[PDB]
Amino acid sequence: QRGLAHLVVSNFRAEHLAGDATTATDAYLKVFFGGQEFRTGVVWNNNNPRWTDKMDFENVLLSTGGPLRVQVWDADAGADDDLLGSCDRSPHSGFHEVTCELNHGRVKFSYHAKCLPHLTGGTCLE
Ligand SMILES: [Ca+2]
Ligand SMILES: [Ca+2]
Ligand SMILES: [Ca+2]
Ligand SMILES: [Ca+2]
Ligand SMILES: [Ca+2]
């Protein structure tokens, strides 16, 4: 079947975040694709957080599996957290570096969408 690709998202890092008023940001990420939802740990009190996580989505429908969505959240340990911003990309085959400009600050990451063997093209349809 066509449209299949191995998706891996990695190299997470943000800068100039402002999720709190009296302390530095307590950031964590949510990464969405094809019904899958990965979550990073919280980097407490840092406005330039980095995550070592490498998310293996395995084989997904690159063409119809919706957008790759990255949400940047601040953690307020008093229950309700803050959505600092969200990024949407339509993944293409190959290695790509992404920069999402949030309302305040930005998040950077990379993803690799490797077409399954005997498949080729931007979304592995050929
Ligand atoms: Ca907050
Ligand atoms: Ca904080
Ligand atoms: Ca917080
Ligand atoms: Ca909470
Ligand atoms: Ca809050």
UniProtKB/Swiss-Prot annotation:
Tissue: Detected in cytotoxic T-lymphocytes and natural killer cells.
Binding-site residues, Ca(2+) 3: 20, 26, 74-76
Protein's cellular compartments: Cytolytic granule; Secreted; Cell membrane; Endosome lumen
Chain sites annotated for binding Ca(2+) 5: 76, 79, 81
Result of knocking out the encoding gene: Mice are viable and fertile, but die of virus infections that are normally efficiently dealt with by the immune system. They cannot eliminate lymphocytic choriomeningitis virus, but die of the infection. Young mice are abnormally susceptible to mouse hepatitis virus. Cytolytic activity towards tumor cells and transplants is also severely reduced.
Segments forming domain C2: 1-104
Post-translational modification: N-glycosylated. The glycosylation sites are facing the interior of the pore.
Binding annotation for Ca(2+) 2: 20, 23-24, 26, 45, 58
Annotated binding of Ca(2+) 1, by residue: 19-20, 74, 76, 82
Binding residues for Ca(2+) 4: 76, 80, 82
Disulfide bond residue pairs: 87-100, 115-124
Function text: Pore-forming protein that plays a key role in granzyme-mediated programmed cell death, and in defense against virus-infected or neoplastic cells. Can insert into the membrane of target cells in its calcium-bound form, oligomerize and form large pores. Promotes cytolysis and apoptosis of target cells by mediating the passage and uptake of cytotoxic granzymes. Facilitates the delivery of cationic cargo protein, while anionic or neural proteins are not delivered efficiently. Perforin pores allow the release of mature caspase-7 (CASP7) into the extracellular milieu.
SUBUNIT field: Monomer, as soluble protein. Homooligomer; homooligomerizes to form a pore-forming ring.
Domain comment (free text): Perforin consists of three domains: (1) the MACPF domain, which includes the central machinery of pore formation, (2) the EGF-like domain, which forms a 'shelf-like' assembly connecting the MACPF and C2 domains, and (3) the C2 domain, which mediates calcium-dependent binding to lipid membranes.
Family to which the UniProt record says this protein belongs: Belongs to the complement C6/C7/C8/C9 family.
Protein name: Perforin-1
The encoding gene: Prf1
Span of the entire protein shown here: 410 to 535 of 554
